[PDB]
Amino acid sequence: QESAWGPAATIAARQSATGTKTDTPIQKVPQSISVVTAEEMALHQPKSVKEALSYTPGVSVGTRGASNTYDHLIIRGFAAEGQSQNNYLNGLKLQGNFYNDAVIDPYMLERAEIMRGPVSVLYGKSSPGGLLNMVSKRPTTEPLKEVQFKAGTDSLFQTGFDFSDSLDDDGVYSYRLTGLARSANAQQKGSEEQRYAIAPAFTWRPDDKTNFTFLSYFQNEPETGYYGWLPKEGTVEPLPNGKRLPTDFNEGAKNNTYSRNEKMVGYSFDHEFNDTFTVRQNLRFAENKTSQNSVYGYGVCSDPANAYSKQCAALAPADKGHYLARKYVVDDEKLQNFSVDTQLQSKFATGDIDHTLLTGVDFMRMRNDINAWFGYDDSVPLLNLYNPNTDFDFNAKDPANSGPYRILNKQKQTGVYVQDQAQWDKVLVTLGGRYDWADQESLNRVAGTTDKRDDKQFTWRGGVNYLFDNGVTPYFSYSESFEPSSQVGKDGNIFAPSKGKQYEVGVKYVPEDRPIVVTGAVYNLTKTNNLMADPEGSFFSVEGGEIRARGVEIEAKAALSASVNVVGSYTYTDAEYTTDTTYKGNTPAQVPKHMASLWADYTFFDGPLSGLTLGTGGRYTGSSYGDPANSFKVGSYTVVDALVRYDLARVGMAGSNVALHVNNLFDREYVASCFNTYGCFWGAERQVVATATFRF
Amino acid sequence: SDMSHVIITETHSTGLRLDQGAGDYYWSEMPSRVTQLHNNDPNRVVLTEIEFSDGSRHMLSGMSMGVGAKAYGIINPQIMSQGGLKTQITASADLSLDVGYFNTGTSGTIPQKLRDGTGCQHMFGAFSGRRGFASSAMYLGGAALYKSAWSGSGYVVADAGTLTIPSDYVRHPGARNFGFNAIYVRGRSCNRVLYGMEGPNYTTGGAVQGASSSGALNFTYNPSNPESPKYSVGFARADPTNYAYWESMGDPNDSANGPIGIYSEHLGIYPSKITWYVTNLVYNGSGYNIDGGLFNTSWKFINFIEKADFRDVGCNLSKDSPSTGISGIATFGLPTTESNNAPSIKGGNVGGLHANVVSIYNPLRLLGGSGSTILSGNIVFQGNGSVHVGTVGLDLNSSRNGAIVCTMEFIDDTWLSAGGIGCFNPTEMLSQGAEYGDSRFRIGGNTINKKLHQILSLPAGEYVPFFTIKGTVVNACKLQAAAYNPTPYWVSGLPGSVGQTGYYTLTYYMRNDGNNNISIWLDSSMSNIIGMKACLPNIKLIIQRLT
Ligand SMILES: CCCCCCCCCCCC(=O)O[C@H](CCCCCCCCCCC)CC(=O)N[C@H]1[C@H](OC[C@H]2O[C@H](OP(=O)([O-])[O-])[C@H](NC(=O)C[C@H](O)CCCCCCCCCC)[C@@H](OC(=O)C[C@@H](O)CCCCCCCCCCC)[C@@H]2O)O[C@H](CO[C@]2(C(=O)O)C[C@@H](O[C@]3(C(=O)O)C[C@@H](O)[C@@H](O)[C@@H]([C@H](O)CO)O3)[C@@H](O)[C@@H]([C@H](O)CO)O2)[C@@H](OP(=O)([O-])[O-])[C@@H]1OC(=O)CCOC(=O)CCCCCCCC
Ligand SMILES: CCCCCCCCCC[N+](C)(C)[O-]
């Protein structure tokens, strides 16, 4: 006997639609790709998609610490343009703008595959670092009646259900209904989180060739929790009296609010005409809204950024070190996103070479109407950090220290791509290319001014895999990427797109007779045309910057015994500003040099303890620099997660199980990361969650 | 003989010339005695008369100022904040004419010589910003350039953290300590130089390009920390006829930043001769002492005839209402007297004016008493309006008509802020309301003696202008982009990121109430300016009756 997550991590996690847009084994993908399945996520119970990727290399999942508002990922030392999220659902980009970024609950997901390195050859404009692809739960062939309950620390209560069945008796019509209601208290005092998500799905499958699945996902977040900044004085370094801010410190106002609403509908259609021609089309329309009244910290009064503020000026020079300057943002956004991707897959042979030719057309359009009001310096009263919070008037919008931000952002991307996976005996070359027509239009409603830029970009990817019969698969690939800029220069023109190029050499060990997945890769990823500070006495940005990231990623999954499953990863990252006006030669913030993670779970299959699973794991994050100037450093930390799971099948409930998850078992107090001297984030406190899943 | 008769003891004349590259600056070297009196004996009241080519003669009276200012406040919450201010201030020793003094010893042409004379443009500039989130460092340059005690936008800069201009680096028209030996006069108003919107670049040497410059000072705060805000403040005296700007900080003549130019309203008259009437009136700090001309040859008398051998000279203007009927640049016509002693107004666009004249023939003795006040404070104008601002305690009924001797003694350099937009921190306007801030240029302690003497008549109930400030301002936007939102300082908004040009005129009136008091009235007329903060020029007005 063996557990469900065992084969899932080492067998089911070998298929990958991401990285090639065709269902290809990972060893035949010329690029690094990690797959997390629903069974692995069922075992670990990640709070979001970020924690699901805790044991994969090359990705920094916990830079924001205890905050859960966004699923932001730093992949290979890079983030999306504007610190957005480069997240994809069902092969279509979850496009977001400004604070309007959508998140998908992991309980609604069947898989989460993360592509590392440029993937613009397939998905259009994308970050150089990589891409996260989420796959929605689809209706199941067999009936499913699952209810889940959670009762954790910080007053956590989650009730969820996952029902699937076949409407007809043969199976052509089947549905799935996944929902969850989650309420919890945030780590920071006075902040709460509420989420209601439901995912109606419907599959029409007239026969084995054709398949039409309707995918919808509606989420309501009356409160998304804490998203504030804390100074490095008090978190990384002691306060002047020698103390540190408590990990539950909340610098925001009492009436801080943060809402999100997500409504997306779409479909996933595939149809095989014959053994030669197969068509696929993915479509989705999403309507996301975000509201927010946030007061956030902006470093202590002795921070250089607050050099001449009036409120900090009136303090005594000694007192300036333990007073937190604050600002505010009042935001209301409405985003409309539509994306459709059509692919024609052709399979044919040219002599002794097997060709799998993929030809696709992808279209994307996004609109985001922002109605924001930003508090500038001295817009919020100072907060004493030596105190043993009150309300804020978010409607008293003083023009002296605050201003409007009313912007209508329009984006459009059309892409035509051709990919060829030609296989000759053991050699599999992957040559692909894509042409994009990214257009962007921004309108400032306050001044009635418009910024517009149309970009024509060509990106190609070329990789070679040699498939030894031992399962060892050496590979090397070159991938290009592009990301249109959003800023303008001194002349008011939007900059040319930044481009990412990568050389990656790796080896994948995917044996066909053993449940082991070992992958390693060494990469050289450069982001040219990065934006940097003006060296000529202006504060505008200029083009011409360059960031280079090299490193080694090792990932291992194995089932050493039928009772023992081990997931581990190691990462070495060398990120450096190769060309930049300031920060030249510096390492980007929140990028550690070394990251490691190890997981192991033991399942008892005999004796009095039969059906019991003991899980334990540990994530190590090396020291990272706290600001682009590399002035200070954030220390390393190791976080240990435990797990106790009991299969209720023996007690009489097949499929059911009760688990107890402890995250940060040793309750380490650490700073997760800092992006500057004024923005620092506490790591998550120890969390104990008892969860019961019942299968009817 | 004992009744303190006011007599003109000596008379000096010079012929003007457009020599040494002076296009429209009719200049002349002052007679040695006139130079000695102007510099080493500034308490003696000397009357200056301009005679124009058309035969009309005008007696110099009052003071006038010319302001050209630009300011922008662009910001992007995610990227950066950046702001800049630039003001050019000219002054004249006359209400309507462009009169000033300079040294012939300075190098260059006459306009270039004016860079060290009273006719220079006092150029003040600030540039600031910070690259970061939700930055407000657009206003740091304004906080550094201007000394303000008002509690508003976050930035306040200490005196040691910015630039202070010594009092001897500025050139007031009535300054007596610089040893001027030449005079210039034009039939125009002060140049309102409207060029540039930023101060010195902190990555350059701070040099001034364009016009011949002097007295250049600048302060720069350029830390090595990329998170610190950076700002620069600069000052320079420049030739008033050319565009002066700091290095790498020139003005784009584009829509976002408004127009450029040198603005000066002509009067249609061209000077041809200057006469100095040295009198026996000696100012003594509080009043005047009759010294000299005791009861001779070439001893002219002064009188105010209430309508042949008399040489009538138009002295001042009188109007029934302080309002000029204009919205924008209000130009007062020159009160002159024709060759046949006929009063007339030359040029201008303000109606309802009357030409008051003096009679110089070869009485009007001093009347004991006198009175003084210091015009100090700040007046906030939300449009066109006239405000009572001062009072001088003397009775004008005993005087012959409203004849008085007036001395405007400037105690400090607050006159450089006597204008509206461009003479104070534009961030004062952001906190909408009637807030009376004291934002002013950071000029050092006074070391220069600034006096202007004039003789003028105050008709009963009529308003007599004696200090005008004309200003052409642009609420600029650095660029036209949706990424950066410009700040509307003194306009409702920038409807297309297009610079909004504004005009204003501040005029101080001296009204003979007849209730043994002289009231002081400040009038404002604006165009495309929602609000202004006028700073009282800290003028000590000394008035003595004449009968
Ligand atoms: C059978 C197989 C499937 C077959 C599927 C085939 C679908 C293919 C569709 C492709 C085209 C498209 O993309 O369709 C989108 C999405 C629609 C849903 C799609 C299906 C989802 C799910 C698909 C089905 C899944 C199974 C339309 C949209 O997004 N509309 C939103 C709109 O913004 C976009 C507009 O501009 C764009 O171009 P731009 O100008 O920006 O450049 C669009 N042109 C394009 O795309 C062209 C494109 O590039 C060409 C390429 C096409 C590629 C196709 C290949 C592929 C084909 C595949 C085969 C243009 O579309 C059109 O022109 C019509 C046509 O294209 C759609 C018809 C067919 C689809 C519907 C049937 C549905 C299909 C049948 C399903 C039953 C559109 O009008 O703003 C409205 C609000 O406006 C205001 C308001 O006052 O507040 C005022 C406004 O001001 C203004 C103003 O600016 O307008 C100005 C003022 O001066 C003043 O005049 C003022 C006036 O007073 C006002 O009258 O208007 C402004 O201020 C804004 C402000 O910005 C706030 O943000 O606010 C929103 O309303 P809201 O938010 O308040 O409710 C609205 O959202 C709502 O409607 C959406 C509601 O969702 C629901 O119904 C979904 C239900 C689904 C079923 C449920 C499950 C069933 C079991
Ligand atoms: C995502 C774009 C944000 C632009 C403004 C950045 C400064 C305000 C950030 C406020 N907060 C810390 C709550 O995100």
Q: Dihedral sign, CA of A46, A50, A51, A55?
A: positive
Look up residue B383 and give its two tokens: 């449009």
Which residue owns the Cα nearest ligand 2 atom 1?
A98
Would you say B544 and B399 are in contact if contact means Cβ atoms under 8 Å apart?
no
Q: Are strands A657-663 and A687-695 parallel, antiparallel or unpaired?
A: antiparallel
| Range B17-38 burial, b when 16+ CB lie within 10 A, else e | eeeeebeebbbbebbeebbebb
Chain B: give the shortest CA distance to residue A496, in Å.
Answer: 15
The rounded distance, in Å, linking the Cα atoms of A255 and A252 is 8
Is the backbone of residue A167 left (phi > 0), alpha (psi -120 to 50) or beta?
alpha
Helix (H) or strand (E) run with residue A41 in it: helix A38-44
Question: What's the domain range around A68?
Answer: 4-695
One-letter identity of residue A571: T
CA separation (Å) from B218 to A199, B139, B156, B201, B243? 65, 18, 18, 10, 18
Nearest to B186 by CA among B57, B338, B52, B66: B52
Residue B406 domain flag: no
Would you say A678 and A231 are in contact if contact means Cβ atoms under 8 Å apart?
yes
- If you count them, how many residues does chain A have? 696
Would you say A495 and A476 are in contact if contact means Cβ atoms under 8 Å apart?
no
CA separation (Å) from B356 to B185, B318, B455? 21, 7, 11
User: Which residues does B391 contact at the CB level (< 8 Å), separation at least 6?
Assistant: B373, B517, B518, B519, B520
List the beta bridge partners of residue A146.
A162, A695
Nearest to A506 by CA among A490, A516, A496, A519: A519
Is the backbone of residue B233 left (phi > 0), alpha (psi -120 to 50) or beta?
beta
Q: Nearest by CB to A487, which of B79, B130, B161?
A: B79
Nearest to A500 by CA among A520, A474, A477, A529: A529
- Dihedral of the CA atoms B392, B398, B402, B404 (nearest 10)? -60
The rounded distance, in Å, linking the Cα atoms of B10 and A60 is 91
Helix (H) or strand (E) run with residue A282 in it: strand A277-300
Q: Tell me which of A99, A329, A333 to substitute to probe ligand 2's pocket, judged by most ligand atoms within 8 Å of the beta carbon.
A: A329
User: Which residues does B368 contact at the CB level (< 8 Å), separation at least 6?
Assistant: none
Q: Are strands A130-136 and A87-89 parallel, antiparallel or unpaired?
A: parallel
Would you say A406 and A445 are in contact if contact means Cβ atoms under 8 Å apart?
yes
List the beta bridge partners of residue A25.
A15
φ, ψ (nearest 5 deg) of residue A10: -115, -10
The rounded distance, in Å, linking the Cα atoms of B236 and B121 is 8
Partner-chain contact B134 A329, CB within 8 Å: yes
User: Which residues does B25 contact at the CB level (< 8 Å), separation at least 6?
Assistant: B18, B110, B111, B114, B119, B184, B185, B186
Q: Nearest by CB to A398, which of B431, B481, B482?
A: B431
Nearest to A19 by CA among A7, A5, A29: A29
User: Measured in angstroms, how far is the CA atom of residue A285 from the centroid of ligand 1?
Assistant: 9
**Degrees (nearest 5) of the Cα angle B519, B524, B530?**
145
Residues followed by a gap in chain A, C→N > 2.5 Å: 388
- DSSP tag of A84: -
B486 at A interface, C-beta within 8 A: yes
Residues followed by a gap in chain B, C→N > 2.5 Å: 295, 307, 362
List the beta bridge partners of residue B313.
B358
The rounded distance, in Å, linking the Cα atoms of B424 and B535 is 8
Is the backbone of residue B248 left (phi > 0), alpha (psi -120 to 50) or beta?
left
Q: Dihedral sign, CA of A136, A141, A145, A150?
A: negative
The rounded distance, in Å, linking the Cα atoms of A531 and A494 is 11
Q: Dihedral sign, CA of B448, B452, B453, B457?
A: negative
CA separation (Å) from A609 to A604, A616, A650, A658? 6, 17, 11, 14
**Degrees (nearest 5) of the Cα angle B91, B94, B96?**
95
Cβ-based burial of B306 (10 A; exposed 0-12, middle 13-18, buried ≥19)? exposed
- Which atom of ligand 1 is nearest to A216's Cα? 134
φ, ψ (nearest 5 deg) of residue A684: -70, 140
The upper half-sphere exposure of residue A643, i.e. CA atoms within 13 Å in the direction of its Cβ, equals 23
The rounded distance, in Å, linking the Cα atoms of B262 and B26 is 18
Q: How many domains does chain B have?
A: 1
Partner-chain contact B493 A535, CB within 8 Å: no
Residue B295 domain flag: yes
Which residue owns the Cα nearest ligand 1 atom 113?
A369
Residue B48 domain flag: yes
The rounded distance, in Å, linking the Cα atoms of A212 and B139 is 59
Task: Give the SS3 label for residue B395.
Answer: coil
A537 at B interface, C-beta within 8 A: yes
Q: Which residues of B touch A449 (CB under 8 A)?
A: 480-482, 496-497
Experimental method: cryo-EM
Span between the terminal Cα atoms of chain A, in Å: 22
List the beta bridge partners of residue A643.
A615, A661
Check which CATH number belongs to the domain holding A413 and give it: 2.40.170.20
The rounded distance, in Å, linking the Cα atoms of B85 and B70 is 6
Q: Are strands B288-290 and B271-283 parallel, antiparallel or unpaired?
A: antiparallel
H helices of A486-628, in order, are none
Question: What's the domain range around B17?
Answer: 7-62+267-361
Q: How many domains does chain A have?
A: 1
Q: Could you tell me where the beta strands, DSSP code E, fall in A122-172?
A: 130-136, 144-152, 156-166
The rounded distance, in Å, linking the Cα atoms of B161 and B12 is 49
Span between the terminal Cα atoms of chain B, in Å: 14
User: Which residues does B254 contact at the CB level (< 8 Å), separation at least 6?
Assistant: none
Helix (H) or strand (E) run with residue A44 in it: helix A38-44
Q: Tell me which of B75, B78, B485 to substitute to probe ligand 2's pocket, judged by most ligand atoms within 8 Å of the beta carbon.
A: B78
Residue B40 domain flag: yes
User: Which residues does B5 contact at the CB level (< 8 Å), separation at least 6?
Assistant: B290, B293, B295, B301, B363, B364, B365, B366
The string of DSSP letters for A614-676 reads: EEEEEEEE--EESSTT--SEEPPEEEEEEEEEEETTTTT-TT-EEEEEEESTT----EEEESS
User: Measured in angstroms, how far is the CA atom of residue B505 from the centroid of ligand 2?
Assistant: 43
B433 at A interface, C-beta within 8 A: no
The rounded distance, in Å, linking the Cα atoms of A303 and A38 is 45
One-letter identity of residue A122: L
Nearest to B403 by CA among B312, B513, B302: B302
Q: Which residue has the tokens 């060290």?
A: B116
Would you say B216 and B236 are in contact if contact means Cβ atoms under 8 Å apart?
yes
User: Which residues does B173 contact at the CB level (< 8 Å), separation at least 6?
Assistant: B63, B91, B92, B93, B99, B100, B101, B118, B452
Residue B166 domain flag: no
Q: Which residue has the tokens 């209400």?
A: B95
Look up residue A206 and give its two tokens: 């007239």
Nearest to A42 by CA among A655, A684, A677, A675: A655
Q: Nearest by CB to A448, which of B161, B431, B495?
A: B495
3-state secondary structure B404-437: EEEEEEECCCHHHHCCCCCCCCHHHHCCCCCCCC
B339 at A interface, C-beta within 8 A: no
